[PDB]
Design an enzyme around this catalytic site. Sequence first.
Site, PDB file in Angstrom:
ATOM      1  N   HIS A   3       0.830  -1.195   0.000  1.00 25.03           N
ATOM      2  CA  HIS A   3       0.000   0.000   0.000  1.00 25.03           C
ATOM      3  C   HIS A   3       0.875   1.261   0.000  1.00 25.03           C
ATOM      4  O   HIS A   3       0.735   2.121  -0.873  1.00 25.03           O
ATOM      5  CB  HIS A   3      -0.904  -0.019   1.244  1.00 25.03           C
ATOM      6  CG  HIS A   3      -1.790   1.185   1.383  1.00 25.03           C
ATOM      7  ND1 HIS A   3      -3.090   1.212   0.924  1.00 25.03           N
ATOM      8  CD2 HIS A   3      -1.565   2.397   1.948  1.00 25.03           C
ATOM      9  CE1 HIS A   3      -3.628   2.387   1.204  1.00 25.03           C
ATOM     10  NE2 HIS A   3      -2.724   3.123   1.826  1.00 25.03           N
ATOM     11  N   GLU A   4       1.776   1.367   0.980  1.00 24.88           N
ATOM     12  CA  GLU A   4       2.653   2.531   1.086  1.00 24.88           C
ATOM     13  C   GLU A   4       3.552   2.719  -0.148  1.00 24.88           C
ATOM     14  O   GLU A   4       3.738   3.845  -0.624  1.00 24.88           O
ATOM     15  CB  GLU A   4       3.530   2.437   2.337  1.00 24.88           C
ATOM     16  CG  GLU A   4       2.775   2.391   3.652  1.00 24.88           C
ATOM     17  CD  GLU A   4       1.763   3.510   3.793  1.00 24.88           C
ATOM     18  OE1 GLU A   4       2.116   4.666   3.479  1.00 24.88           O
ATOM     19  OE2 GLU A   4       0.620   3.234   4.228  1.00 24.88           O
ATOM     20  N   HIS A  35       1.932   4.616  -2.678  1.00 29.43           N
ATOM     21  CA  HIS A  35       2.038   6.063  -2.501  1.00 29.43           C
ATOM     22  C   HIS A  35       3.432   6.527  -2.958  1.00 29.43           C
ATOM     23  O   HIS A  35       3.566   7.515  -3.679  1.00 29.43           O
ATOM     24  CB  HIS A  35       1.830   6.442  -1.031  1.00 29.43           C
ATOM     25  CG  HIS A  35       0.422   6.271  -0.543  1.00 29.43           C
ATOM     26  ND1 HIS A  35      -0.652   6.900  -1.135  1.00 29.43           N
ATOM     27  CD2 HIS A  35      -0.077   5.601   0.526  1.00 29.43           C
ATOM     28  CE1 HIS A  35      -1.750   6.632  -0.449  1.00 29.43           C
ATOM     29  NE2 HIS A  35      -1.428   5.848   0.563  1.00 29.43           N
ATOM     30  N   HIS A  51      -5.062   7.447  -2.935  1.00 23.98           N
ATOM     31  CA  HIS A  51      -6.013   6.451  -2.472  1.00 23.98           C
ATOM     32  C   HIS A  51      -7.075   6.183  -3.524  1.00 23.98           C
ATOM     33  O   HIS A  51      -7.487   7.083  -4.258  1.00 23.98           O
ATOM     34  CB  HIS A  51      -6.652   6.905  -1.161  1.00 23.98           C
ATOM     35  CG  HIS A  51      -5.776   6.686   0.027  1.00 23.98           C
ATOM     36  ND1 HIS A  51      -5.802   7.505   1.135  1.00 23.98           N
ATOM     37  CD2 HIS A  51      -4.840   5.740   0.280  1.00 23.98           C
ATOM     38  CE1 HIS A  51      -4.919   7.074   2.018  1.00 23.98           C
ATOM     39  NE2 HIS A  51      -4.321   6.005   1.522  1.00 23.98           N
TER      40      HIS A  51
HETATM   41  O1  LIG Z   1      -7.070   0.652  10.062  1.00 24.21           O
HETATM   42  C1  LIG Z   1      -7.552   1.281   9.124  1.00 24.21           C
HETATM   43  O2  LIG Z   1      -7.928   0.731   8.089  1.00 24.21           O
HETATM   44  C2  LIG Z   1      -7.674   2.827   9.237  1.00 24.21           C
HETATM   45  C3  LIG Z   1      -6.307   3.566   9.286  1.00 24.21           C
HETATM   46  N1  LIG Z   1      -5.559   3.011   8.145  1.00 24.21           N
HETATM   47  C4  LIG Z   1      -4.221   3.148   7.944  1.00 24.21           C
HETATM   48  O3  LIG Z   1      -3.469   3.793   8.670  1.00 24.21           O
HETATM   49  C5  LIG Z   1      -3.590   2.429   6.812  1.00 24.21           C
HETATM   50  C6  LIG Z   1      -4.195   1.456   6.112  1.00 24.21           C
HETATM   51  C7  LIG Z   1      -3.333   0.877   5.074  1.00 24.21           C
HETATM   52  C8  LIG Z   1      -3.772  -0.213   4.208  1.00 24.21           C
HETATM   53  C9  LIG Z   1      -3.034  -1.421   4.185  1.00 24.21           C
HETATM   54  C10 LIG Z   1      -3.448  -2.502   3.390  1.00 24.21           C
HETATM   55  C11 LIG Z   1      -4.610  -2.423   2.590  1.00 24.21           C
HETATM   56  C12 LIG Z   1      -5.060  -3.606   1.758  1.00 24.21           C
HETATM   57  C13 LIG Z   1      -5.925  -3.455   0.665  1.00 24.21           C
HETATM   58  C14 LIG Z   1      -6.317  -4.597  -0.067  1.00 24.21           C
HETATM   59  N2  LIG Z   1      -5.898  -5.859   0.232  1.00 24.21           N
HETATM   60  C15 LIG Z   1      -5.060  -6.003   1.294  1.00 24.21           C
HETATM   61  C16 LIG Z   1      -4.623  -4.915   2.072  1.00 24.21           C
HETATM   62  C17 LIG Z   1      -5.343  -1.203   2.610  1.00 24.21           C
HETATM   63  C18 LIG Z   1      -4.934  -0.109   3.407  1.00 24.21           C
HETATM   64  C19 LIG Z   1      -2.117   1.450   5.055  1.00 24.21           C
HETATM   65  S1  LIG Z   1      -1.942   2.701   6.269  1.00 24.21           S
HETATM   66  C20 LIG Z   1      -6.529   5.100   9.329  1.00 24.21           C
HETATM   67  C21 LIG Z   1      -7.207   5.672  10.461  1.00 24.21           C
HETATM   68  C22 LIG Z   1      -7.431   7.066  10.560  1.00 24.21           C
HETATM   69  C23 LIG Z   1      -6.984   7.924   9.528  1.00 24.21           C
HETATM   70  C24 LIG Z   1      -6.321   7.384   8.408  1.00 24.21           C
HETATM   71  C25 LIG Z   1      -6.095   5.991   8.310  1.00 24.21           C
HETATM   72  O1  LIG Z   2     -15.728   9.968   2.910  1.00 24.41           O
HETATM   73  C1  LIG Z   2     -15.914   9.452   1.799  1.00 24.41           C
HETATM   74  O2  LIG Z   2     -17.028   9.431   1.258  1.00 24.41           O
HETATM   75  C2  LIG Z   2     -14.692   8.805   1.054  1.00 24.41           C
HETATM   76  C3  LIG Z   2     -13.693   9.791   0.342  1.00 24.41           C
HETATM   77  N1  LIG Z   2     -13.611  10.946   1.242  1.00 24.41           N
HETATM   78  C4  LIG Z   2     -13.310  12.161   0.698  1.00 24.41           C
HETATM   79  O3  LIG Z   2     -13.073  12.328  -0.505  1.00 24.41           O
HETATM   80  C5  LIG Z   2     -13.281  13.387   1.505  1.00 24.41           C
HETATM   81  C6  LIG Z   2     -13.751  13.507   2.757  1.00 24.41           C
HETATM   82  C7  LIG Z   2     -13.613  14.875   3.280  1.00 24.41           C
HETATM   83  C8  LIG Z   2     -14.078  15.272   4.613  1.00 24.41           C
HETATM   84  C9  LIG Z   2     -14.870  16.442   4.755  1.00 24.41           C
HETATM   85  C10 LIG Z   2     -15.365  16.829   6.017  1.00 24.41           C
HETATM   86  C11 LIG Z   2     -15.096  16.073   7.177  1.00 24.41           C
HETATM   87  C12 LIG Z   2     -15.671  16.486   8.513  1.00 24.41           C
HETATM   88  C13 LIG Z   2     -15.104  16.076   9.741  1.00 24.41           C
HETATM   89  C14 LIG Z   2     -15.703  16.488  10.952  1.00 24.41           C
HETATM   90  N2  LIG Z   2     -16.822  17.272  11.003  1.00 24.41           N
HETATM   91  C15 LIG Z   2     -17.370  17.665   9.818  1.00 24.41           C
HETATM   92  C16 LIG Z   2     -16.835  17.300   8.569  1.00 24.41           C
HETATM   93  C17 LIG Z   2     -14.294  14.908   7.034  1.00 24.41           C
HETATM   94  C18 LIG Z   2     -13.787  14.505   5.773  1.00 24.41           C
HETATM   95  C19 LIG Z   2     -13.045  15.696   2.379  1.00 24.41           C
HETATM   96  S1  LIG Z   2     -12.649  14.898   0.872  1.00 24.41           S
HETATM   97  C20 LIG Z   2     -12.351   9.074   0.080  1.00 24.41           C
HETATM   98  C21 LIG Z   2     -12.293   8.018  -0.866  1.00 24.41           C
HETATM   99  C22 LIG Z   2     -11.089   7.336  -1.147  1.00 24.41           C
HETATM  100  C23 LIG Z   2      -9.910   7.691  -0.473  1.00 24.41           C
HETATM  101  C24 LIG Z   2      -9.936   8.731   0.476  1.00 24.41           C
HETATM  102  C25 LIG Z   2     -11.141   9.415   0.747  1.00 24.41           C
HETATM  103 ZN   LIG Z   3      -2.566   5.225   2.287  1.00 24.81          ZN
END
Ligand SMILES: O=C(O)C[C@@H](NC(=O)c1cc(-c2ccc(-c3ccncc3)cc2)cs1)c1ccccc1
Ligand SMILES: O=C(O)C[C@@H](NC(=O)c1cc(-c2ccc(-c3ccncc3)cc2)cs1)c1ccccc1
Ligand SMILES: [Zn+2]
Lengths: 159, 159, 159, 159, 159, 159
Positions: free
Chosen positions: B113-114, B117, B123
């Site tokens: 995943h990383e 990036h 994402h």
């Molecule tokens: O635990 C979570 O999923 C939320 C947390 N995530 C992370 O930090 C992260 C989640 C991942 C990630 C790792 C593997 C896969 C994946 C996809 C498909 N098949 C196998 C593996 C998807 C995402 C990397 S950092 C997070 C929390 C709050 C804000 C941002 C991200």
């Molecule tokens: O949330 C979704 O529908 C998924 C999508 N998200 C976005 O694009 C996005 C989500 C946001 C976002 C906006 C407002 C708040 C918020 C927090 C607290 N109080 C009020 C408002 C949190 C997140 C901006 S873009 C997304 C998809 C794929 C990868 C990353 C994020």
């Molecule tokens: Zn990521």
Amino acid sequence: GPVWRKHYITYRINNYTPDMNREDVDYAIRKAFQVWSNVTPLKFSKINTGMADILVVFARGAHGDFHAFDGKGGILAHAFGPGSGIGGDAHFDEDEFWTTHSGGTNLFLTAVHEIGHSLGLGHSSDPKAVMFPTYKYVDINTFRLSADDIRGIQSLYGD
Amino acid sequence: GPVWRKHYITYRINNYTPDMNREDVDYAIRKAFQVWSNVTPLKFSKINTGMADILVVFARGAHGDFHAFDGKGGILAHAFGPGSGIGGDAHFDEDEFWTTHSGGTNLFLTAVHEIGHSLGLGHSSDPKAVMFPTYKYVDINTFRLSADDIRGIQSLYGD
Amino acid sequence: GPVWRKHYITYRINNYTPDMNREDVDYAIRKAFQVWSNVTPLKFSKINTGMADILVVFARGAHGDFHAFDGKGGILAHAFGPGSGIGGDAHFDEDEFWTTHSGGTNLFLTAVHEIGHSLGLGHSSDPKAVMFPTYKYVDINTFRLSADDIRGIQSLYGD
Amino acid sequence: GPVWRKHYITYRINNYTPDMNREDVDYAIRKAFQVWSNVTPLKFSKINTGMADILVVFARGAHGDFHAFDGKGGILAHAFGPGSGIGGDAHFDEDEFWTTHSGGTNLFLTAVHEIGHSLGLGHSSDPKAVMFPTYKYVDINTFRLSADDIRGIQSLYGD
Amino acid sequence: GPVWRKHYITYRINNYTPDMNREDVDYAIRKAFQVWSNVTPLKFSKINTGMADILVVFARGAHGDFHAFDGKGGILAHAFGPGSGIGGDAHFDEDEFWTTHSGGTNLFLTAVHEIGHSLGLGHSSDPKAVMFPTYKYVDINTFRLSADDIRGIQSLYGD
Amino acid sequence: GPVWRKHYITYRINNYTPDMNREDVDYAIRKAFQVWSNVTPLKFSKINTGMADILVVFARGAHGDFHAFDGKGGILAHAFGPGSGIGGDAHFDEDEFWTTHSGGTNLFLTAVHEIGHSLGLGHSSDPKAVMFPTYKYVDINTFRLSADDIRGIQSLYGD
Ligand SMILES: O=C(O)C[C@@H](NC(=O)c1cc(-c2ccc(-c3ccncc3)cc2)cs1)c1ccccc1
Ligand SMILES: O=C(O)C[C@@H](NC(=O)c1cc(-c2ccc(-c3ccncc3)cc2)cs1)c1ccccc1
Ligand SMILES: [Zn+2]
Ligand SMILES: O=C(O)C[C@@H](NC(=O)c1cc(-c2ccc(-c3ccncc3)cc2)cs1)c1ccccc1
Ligand SMILES: O=C(O)C[C@@H](NC(=O)c1cc(-c2ccc(-c3ccncc3)cc2)cs1)c1ccccc1
Ligand SMILES: O=C(O)C[C@@H](NC(=O)c1cc(-c2ccc(-c3ccncc3)cc2)cs1)c1ccccc1
Ligand SMILES: O=C(O)C[C@@H](NC(=O)c1cc(-c2ccc(-c3ccncc3)cc2)cs1)c1ccccc1
Ligand SMILES: O=C(O)C[C@@H](NC(=O)c1cc(-c2ccc(-c3ccncc3)cc2)cs1)c1ccccc1
Ligand SMILES: O=C(O)C[C@@H](NC(=O)c1cc(-c2ccc(-c3ccncc3)cc2)cs1)c1ccccc1
Ligand SMILES: O=C(O)C[C@@H](NC(=O)c1cc(-c2ccc(-c3ccncc3)cc2)cs1)c1ccccc1
Ligand SMILES: [Ca+2]
Ligand SMILES: [Ca+2]
Ligand SMILES: [Ca+2]
Ligand SMILES: [Ca+2]
Ligand SMILES: [Ca+2]
Ligand SMILES: [Ca+2]
Ligand SMILES: [Ca+2]
Ligand SMILES: [Ca+2]
Ligand SMILES: [Ca+2]
Ligand SMILES: [Ca+2]
Ligand SMILES: [Ca+2]
Ligand SMILES: [Ca+2]
Ligand SMILES: [Zn+2]
Ligand SMILES: [Zn+2]
Ligand SMILES: [Zn+2]
Ligand SMILES: [Zn+2]
Ligand SMILES: [Zn+2]
Ligand SMILES: [Zn+2]
Ligand SMILES: [Zn+2]
Ligand SMILES: [Zn+2]
Ligand SMILES: [Zn+2]
Ligand SMILES: [Zn+2]
Ligand SMILES: [Zn+2]
């Protein structure tokens, strides 16, 4: 950039001044970095090969960065702030006579000042700060950072 | 920059997490890169000294890039896109418990995943993509890139 | 870089979504910046022509930065951190239905989050923070940043 | 960088050559951009004041970018690839005689080539490509990009 | 950037062409750099490991910098100007047949030309300059820089 | 970078100090640029809206670039060398009393020095140079650059 976006920073001594023993130079530089790592989350490591974040160089006159040295006296050294390439590099005017103590120009004290620039500190207007523009000698055993110096570096890297 | 302007990219493991055997870490990371080199013209090489394009780091809390970790749970890791310095670097939150399998957090899957990036992928909104924001475990032997993942990486590097 | 190295920042609304009235778009964006300027030394100014530090754009699908939008749903918007060029730029997916209320996607609330990115903030793992990655509507009249939001933003610009 | 990370690009004619009428210069430059926008998702806009992504300049001899023009003949023009500052900028040697026909040097045809560089295209080895390094006049009414020209430009911006 | 802001520049031969003996390649490249260090304050050093300022590479077709090679003939090589990453890098089209003399394409002469670009020199319009766009063979023993070449490089680095 | 890669440079007075009349500020700044343009191929233009290469700003205390002013006395002003963003920007400490004469701090004389930095000049060790680090008032009617000032500036832009 305003700061190095990491806590582990490397440095390398490009060349040695024939004014001092190779190891006295290593000691002065290392202790200089230690002065800053003591009050921040930063940590410094010396490397002999490869590119380092901060390249310590001894040179005279024009040496390519367009900020030529002026011979003995006047400008003693200079360094660039954080960044790629020359960023962070500290250059010491070889025309000065570098010493471990008060003879000539003290390398340790000068290095502490330049590394200050290397880490993103500009000149301070406080006469007690190591970042003050004027060079002066003080014994290494009793040398310490002014409060202004601590505030500046911690404002950039915390801790 | 949007992509690495070269096919030979190097990486280096800055430090090792004490959660796994040094070689299990090397294996997870190497296999992770292999996942991407399989579908692109890219090729990855590990180096022990010198600066590499992608620095793999294990760290906890604030580690200098201004995107501090949050302890166990929550954010597991992050990485920066192509570029100089921290560009391409992948950081793993040491507060997580890294494992070779489903115990704790799987290093291989997270690394895939990383590195995504690191190579310029953002994402994905497709739940089957490894670039989807939510972590989940799947066995390494049956793990595969989603079509969305292949399209994204190939859109950037072709082949 | 990790932050804008100035307190006076400009933004420009490149184009307006046909979902709302021009006046409503301006108000929402203005209020979004206000949220952050109220807790930092930062000051924001809207310009109608020329380059701004932060360019607000409404676009759909592939729009040139290699992070294509996904049509209705999923990715709502994204923004680049401080820097030259597209740095600081905020993109809103025109395929979403932008509104001033709880229906469709709330422009103002999404803008506050995006601007967080434009100022150098990454995602938060605190469910109560505007920077949490999941979009959710909240009373737009009693909305306020979470402590984590305040800490992070003042960690960059202080005050 | 290898490409402009956006589909909407601006240009500004810094100054006009006294060789042609202002209206003719504008038309030629407009038509040159049109050639590329017709085969990519790119859209171009001319601005009369302020910073543009692509600055069109007429100059002679040494003009500041260290790639001095050579007077009448030889170097006709040059341009920098995508990037900040002079990146994307196109310089035309005022010592050449710019025209709207086959006499002197044809502005329009030279502009199409230069803009190719401004968009990230290097020279082509195909004799039929506008990016071939050798300037030649061709019926400005039936002019069209060569396949190599189309492939390369769509390889960067697609469509 | 227009120039390398230092006098000590390093280079590294990424890979060797199987057309010549490894040491003939080292000799051609080293002598090529020597041609430029002879008339400037610059000094060049070869390194086997780590990142160097100038990476000499042999490659065919598309190799990641978006300026793909065209097989035998046509473009023989290219290089980027001073800068981080690919900056300064010189790429040689492996589809050409590199030789120590007039058979195929002479590596020494081509290298002198490319290093010219690596140091910040653009193409010259003077037929006697090594920076002239057209390749021609002349014996290494009687090869010399044109006045235009000396002026250009010294305009950038002096001496 | 070490220098602006163009001869036509723009500047903008972001805000005016209440210490002098708007007309006097403009005159002083205009005269300061004139000093340097008179000895180089450079040409300066003031713009009232939009991004300029050199932004002149009056500020006090911490103003965002991590090099906070110190109130009355001490640091009078500072400027960043050529580059994007704040590169080339000149900041004047509003806590100083700006005047058109020998009382308070002379705007014009301080501007000439600051602009020296904005153009790529570092401090001089020659007591007679405007780039010497120590501010001093001199007959603003017979003021002229020192030889060291002329050499350094023409070393960058020639003429
Ligand atoms: O635990 C979570 O999923 C939320 C947390 N995530 C992370 O930090 C992260 C989640 C991942 C990630 C790792 C593997 C896969 C994946 C996809 C498909 N098949 C196998 C593996 C998807 C995402 C990397 S950092 C997070 C929390 C709050 C804000 C941002 C991200
Ligand atoms: O949330 C979704 O529908 C998924 C999508 N998200 C976005 O694009 C996005 C989500 C946001 C976002 C906006 C407002 C708040 C918020 C927090 C607290 N109080 C009020 C408002 C949190 C997140 C901006 S873009 C997304 C998809 C794929 C990868 C990353 C994020
Ligand atoms: Zn990521
Ligand atoms: O000799 C001088 O002081 C002037 C000269 N200075 C330099 O080049 C330099 C002076 C210094 C310097 C070194 C140590 C300390 C210091 C501070 C506190 N405690 C111990 C040590 C302060 C400044 C580094 S370069 C100079 C001349 C002309 C233009 C710029 C600088
Ligand atoms: O049904 C589909 O096909 C997928 C749909 N996508 C989504 O619903 C998506 C859901 C999410 C998502 C984002 C953040 C988190 C999260 C939670 C907790 N802590 C950190 C992060 C979980 C999921 C991204 S896209 C979608 C449809 C159409 C277009 C775009 C996206
Ligand atoms: O007579 C002179 O002094 C030289 C004259 N310069 C020229 O004619 C010049 C001819 C060329 C030239 C350019 C490209 C190619 C080429 C061909 C095939 N494939 C790839 C590239 C060959 C030559 C450059 S300057 C000139 C005169 C005055 C001012 C400038 C140039
Ligand atoms: O061609 C010359 O006279 C030499 C000079 N060339 C230039 O400056 C330039 C040549 C061109 C150019 C313009 C149009 C076309 C073209 C292609 C296909 N159909 C119509 C038009 C090809 C090249 C732009 S600058 C030059 C000199 C030195 C080094 C490089 C190039
Ligand atoms: O074969 C050609 O000359 C054209 C081809 N050129 C190249 O790729 C290249 C030609 C050269 C070159 C090498 C040596 C000399 C030289 C000058 C003076 N004395 C000795 C040697 C000049 C140029 C490097 S790449 C080319 C074709 C199409 C588009 C661009 C370039
Ligand atoms: O009294 C105080 O507290 C300190 C006062 N600061 C000063 O007077 C200061 C004096 C200097 C200074 C600058 C350059 C040189 C110099 C001389 C020769 N060659 C090279 C460089 C010497 C001193 C800096 S601040 C001050 C007060 C209030 C606010 C700011 C500064
Ligand atoms: O000089 C001071 O009062 C200290 C302070 N200096 C400054 O901020 C500054 C001093 C100057 C300056 C202005 C004009 C001249 C000059 C030279 C020759 N003829 C006429 C005018 C020299 C320097 C600009 S900012 C300072 C403090 C701390 C660190 C560096 C500099
Ligand atoms: Ca000296
Ligand atoms: Ca010495
Ligand atoms: Ca965590
Ligand atoms: Ca752990
Ligand atoms: Ca969407
Ligand atoms: Ca919509
Ligand atoms: Ca010409
Ligand atoms: Ca003309
Ligand atoms: Ca070829
Ligand atoms: Ca070969
Ligand atoms: Ca002050
Ligand atoms: Ca004042
Ligand atoms: Zn130096
Ligand atoms: Zn200093
Ligand atoms: Zn990190
Ligand atoms: Zn976008
Ligand atoms: Zn977000
Ligand atoms: Zn030019
Ligand atoms: Zn060209
Ligand atoms: Zn290449
Ligand atoms: Zn060439
Ligand atoms: Zn400032
Ligand atoms: Zn100064």
